[PDB]
Amino acid sequence: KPLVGTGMERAVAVDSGVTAVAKRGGVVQYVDASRIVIKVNEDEMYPGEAGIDIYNLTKYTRSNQNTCINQMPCVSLGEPVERGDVLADGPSTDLGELAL
Amino acid sequence: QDVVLGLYYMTRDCVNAKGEGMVLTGPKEAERLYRSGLASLHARVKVRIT
Amino acid sequence: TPEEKLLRAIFGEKASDVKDSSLRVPNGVSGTVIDVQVFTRDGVEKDKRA
Amino acid sequence: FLKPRLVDIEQVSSTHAKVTLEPLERGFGHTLGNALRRILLSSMPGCAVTEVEIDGVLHEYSTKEGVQEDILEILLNLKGLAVRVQGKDEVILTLNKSGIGPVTAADITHDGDVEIVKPQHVICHLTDENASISMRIKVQRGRGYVPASTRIHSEEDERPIGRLLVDACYSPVERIAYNVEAARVEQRTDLDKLVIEMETNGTIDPEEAIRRAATILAEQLEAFPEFDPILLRPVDDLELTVRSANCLKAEAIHYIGDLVQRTEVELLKTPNLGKKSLTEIKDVLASRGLSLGMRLENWPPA
Amino acid sequence: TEFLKPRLVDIEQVSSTHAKVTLEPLERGFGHTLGNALRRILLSSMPGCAVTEVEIDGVLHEYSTKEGVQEDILEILLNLKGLAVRVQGKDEVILTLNKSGIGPVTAADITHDGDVEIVKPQHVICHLTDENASISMRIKVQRGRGYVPASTRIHLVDACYSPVERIAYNVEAARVEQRTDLDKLVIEMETNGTIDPEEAIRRAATILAEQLEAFV
Amino acid sequence: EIKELLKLGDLPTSGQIRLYDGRTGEQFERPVTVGYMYMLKLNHLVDDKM
Amino acid sequence: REEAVVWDILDEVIREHPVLLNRAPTLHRLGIQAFEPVLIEGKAIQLHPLV
Incomplete structure (x- = not known):
């Protein structure tokens, strides 16, 4: 994490697709290094299909610079999450902030 | 750069320091005086040199 | 050539009709293989590993 | 010419402690202390x-x-x-x-x-x-x-x-720091103390570490071409079957040099070697210009 | 977990009162601690x-x-x-x-x-x-x-x-076989002629050994 | 504000402290600036360039 | 195979055999200078400060 920051790094990390952002608020049903499954709150939820938001995290794979691109879950089993929150960090990102 | 700041900080004098005004037989015991923390690196001193 | 022909008949080695084109790790780089993908022409029989 | 020794070892945590040394002459707290810090951080x-x-x-x-x-x-x-x-x-x-x-x-x-x-x-x-x-x-x-x-x-x-x-x-060792404060023993002109405050993971006792440190420190003061290479290759380099290799090893044949000395007679007399295995061995040896019953006379040099 | 001692000394001395001694292999970072602790003892205490x-x-x-x-x-x-x-x-x-x-x-x-x-x-x-x-x-x-x-x-x-009139230690890279980097420790001294530099080093570091006599 | 946040940390206003050479153990003349800088590793890595 | 002996042999061939060092913007003749090789563990070239 940058120890000396700006306040932009959060925006750069999140707005870029590297991090995994919650589609809808709720609680986390399942937290794995592979996937993260979130049970959606009823208010934000649609009438049909019920449903929960399941985010399949990208794991170790070739980047364009021949570096590594990998995601890690920043959330814990059964945790409150809000819409538009970081569920997982991509490479070189810490807790929704940008660590270069 | 680094080196010239080295020789500059080495060869230089302040107004008052350890061993100010004393006298020594030569550079050998000058360095011997400095390395033991007795004399300051930069101090006004008369020494015998050849 | 002649010296090679002598060499082979002395040591009794069949010189293969096949040259080694095998893909080998570039000199100096050391890592762990995390993935393997095999692409086959549509209509050519897939090998064992594939 | 007073030699130092240790005194109260204060353990403040499972993690770290402060070891202390009473009898230290003029300027020796630094000379001993830093040198001790070095070996402490480095070799343990x-x-x-x-x-x-x-x-x-x-x-x-x-x-x-x-x-x-x-x-x-x-x-x-x-x-x-x-x-x-x-x-x-x-x-x-x-x-x-x-x-x-x-x-x-x-x-x-x-x-x-x-x-x-x-x-x-x-x-x-x-x-x-x-x-x-x-x-x-x-x-x-x-x-x-x-x-x-x-x-x-x-x-x-x-x-x-x-x-x-x-x-x-x-x-x-994680962190080692040494501070010298003037230590006044009952009667003496002026002496120094050595407070070495160290940081550990708990897997080593302070007295033990401080001991070995100076142990090593003093410990430094202690001075203050014929024949074929192929004959010495292990039998595994022949790339025989598991059975043949194990059989040969069981007959005290660990290298190619050992194998090329044996004859067909002698090998067939072993409890575990049949004609198939012998055929394999002769094949692989002939494939590299070797055979059985080869004499090299002088087994081994050094 | 056995240790390493030096094994290639060569005391090259100029004249009599002056000497330049060198020590070949030495574990990484041992050259500075030895060279220094010794310089300290040689100069400040003798x-x-x-x-x-x-x-x-x-x-x-x-x-x-x-x-x-x-x-x-x-x-x-x-x-x-x-x-x-x-x-x-x-x-x-x-x-x-x-x-x-x-x-x-x-x-x-x-x-x-x-x-x-x-x-x-x-x-x-x-x-x-x-x-x-x-x-x-x-x-x-x-x-x-x-x-x-x-x-x-x-x-x-x-x-x-x-x-001692002058004491200096220079630490340079020491190459031994398949060991990557070691220390090479060169101690150079000048004395007043009373005690030869060679023995002087011995007695100097001997003080060090006496100081450690209560530990090892 | 920086010095004021240094006060809350028990650390000097100067940002400079005393440092001791890990070699001779002796102190360095004058205070030196120590702190925490964010540093990046660009990818020019020598095992590529060489 | 990089057998342990070859290194020492290299120390032999390196001793009195100089190498040439050159930088990108070569202007004056000092842009290329000969040195004596000192074997180093690393992939980086160590260049004397005064040069």
């Missing part, structure tokens, strides 16, 4: 975990289903596991756990020389009801920093690909 | 006796002029500091400078005692100008286990005990 026995074979894992770059930690993260966590052994230079432990919840360092099977200084230490978490992880944690003892990369030269069939090598963190 | 104080025959002070000598008393004191004295079981000895003449007073012009040994007869104490130039004085030696300047005597000549 350590037991840091080296090899780890996990359950379904071929490489450290995968993720095991049921654990939110990546495998590499779990290795990195293990590297920070502090253990102390007594009679064994290298012990192998076995970790096992399942169900939802954190897997700590106390979840391992306890051995004779195993002492876990941090039972609360987190190796990895468990996210699912039925999900289980077993692993062999191979812990050996050494000095200094031995990265995982330099660990492979010797090689010699580390083939169990499920075994992931990790960088060696061998060293009890 | 047995030897030279000059502590000398009474003035002509005047009562270090600031004055002697009849027959253009050298200031302090100047002659520096010369006296440069005098090599090696004494026997006698702990403090005193000599005399009795001599006169149209020429310089050397170290061979000093009085000969039983337990006193001056290594350098060519050493210059002070000059003697024209005529008789009355001169002779008494010189008192003393011991120290370090370097003690004249100002440090609070209750005057700077006392130079440690025979």
Whole structure:
């Protein structure tokens, strides 16, 4: 994490697709290094299909610079999450902030 | 750069320091005086040199 | 050539009709293989590993 | 010419302590102290975990289903596991756990020389009801920093690909600091004290470390071409069948030089060698310009 | 988990009072600790006796002029500091400078005692100008286990005990077979000629070994 | 504000402290600036360029 | 195979055998200078400060 920051790094990390952002608020049903499954709150939820938001995290794979691109879950089993929150960090990102 | 700041900080004098005004037989015991923390690196001193 | 022909008949080695084109790790780089993908022409029989 | 010695060793924590030295002459607190700091930081026995074979894992770059930690993260966590052994230079432990919840360092099977200084230490978490992880944690003892990369030269069939090598963190010492304050003993002109305040992981006692440090320090003052190479290759280089190799090794034939001395007669007299095996051996030897009953006269030189 | 000792010494010495010794393999970071701890002990702490104080025959002070000598008393004191004295079981000895003449007073012009040994007869104490130039004085030696300047005597000549004139250690890369990098430790010393640099190193680090005698 | 946040940390206003050479153990003349800088590793890595 | 002996042999061939060092913007003739090789563990070239 940058120890000396700006306040932009959060925006750069999140707005870029590297991090995994919650589609809808709720609680986390399942937290794995592979996937993260979130049970959606009823208010934000649609009438049909019920449903929960399941985010399949990208794991170790070739980047364009021949570096590594990998995601890690920043959330814990059964945790409150809000819409538009970081569920997982991509490479070189810490807790929704940008660590270069 | 680094080196010239080295020789500059080495060869230089302040107004008052350890061993100010004393006298020594030569550079050998000058360095011997400095390395033991007795004399300051930069101090006004008369020494015998050849 | 002649010296090679002598060499082979002395040591009794069949010189293969096949040259080694095998893909080998570039000199100096050391890592762990995390993935393997095999692409086959549509209509050519897939090998064992594939 | 007063020689120093130690005095009250104050242990403030499992982590760190302050060792003190009373009788120190003019300026010697620094000379002894810094020199002691050096050896303390650098050379010290350590037991840091080296090899780890996990359950379904071929490489450290995968993720095991049921654990939110990546495998590499779990290795990195293990590297920070502090253990102390007594009679064994290298012990192998076995970790096992399942169900939802954190897997700590106390979840391992306890051995004779195993002492876990941090039972609360987190190796990895468990996210699912039925999900289980077993692993062999191979812990050996050494000095200094031995990265995982330099660990492979010797090689010699580390083939169990499920075994992931990790960088060696061998060293009890974290932080060492020495302060000299004037120490007034009852009667004496002026003497100094040496307060060495050190930081450890608990796997080494202060008196022990401070002892070995000066032990090594003083310990430094102690001085203050014919024949074929192919004949010495192991039989495995012949690439025989497992049966033939084991049979030959059972007949005290460990190298090619040993094999080329034997005759067909003698080999057929062995309890385990049939005609097929002999055919194979003659074939592989002839394929490299060798045979049986070869004499080299002078076995061996040195 | 056995250790490493050096195994390729080569003491290359210039003349007699000067020496440059080198030590081949040494574990990483051992070259600096050895070189330094030793330099510290060699310079700051060493047995030897030279000059502590000398009474003035002509005047009562270090600031004055002697009849027959253009050298200031302090100047002659520096010369006296440069005098090599090696004494026997006698702990403090005193000599005399009795001599006169149209020429310089050397170290061979000093009085000969039983337990006193001056290594350098060519050493210059002070000059003697024209005529008789009355001169002779008494010189008192003393011991120290370090370097003690004249100002440090609070209750005057700077006392130079440690025979070491100059001590330096240079650490360079040491290559042994399949071991990657090791330390090579080169100790270079200059002494006053009383004790040879070679033994001086030994006794110096011997003090170190004595200090550790309560641990290992 | 920086110095004021240094006060809350028990650390000097100067941002400079005393440092001791890990070699001779002796102190360094003058205070030196120590702190925490964010540093990046660009990818020019030598095992590529070489 | 990089057998342990070859290194020492290299130390033999390197000793009195100089190498040439050159930088990108070569202007004056000092842009290329000869030195004597000193074997180093690393992938980086160590260049004397005064140069």
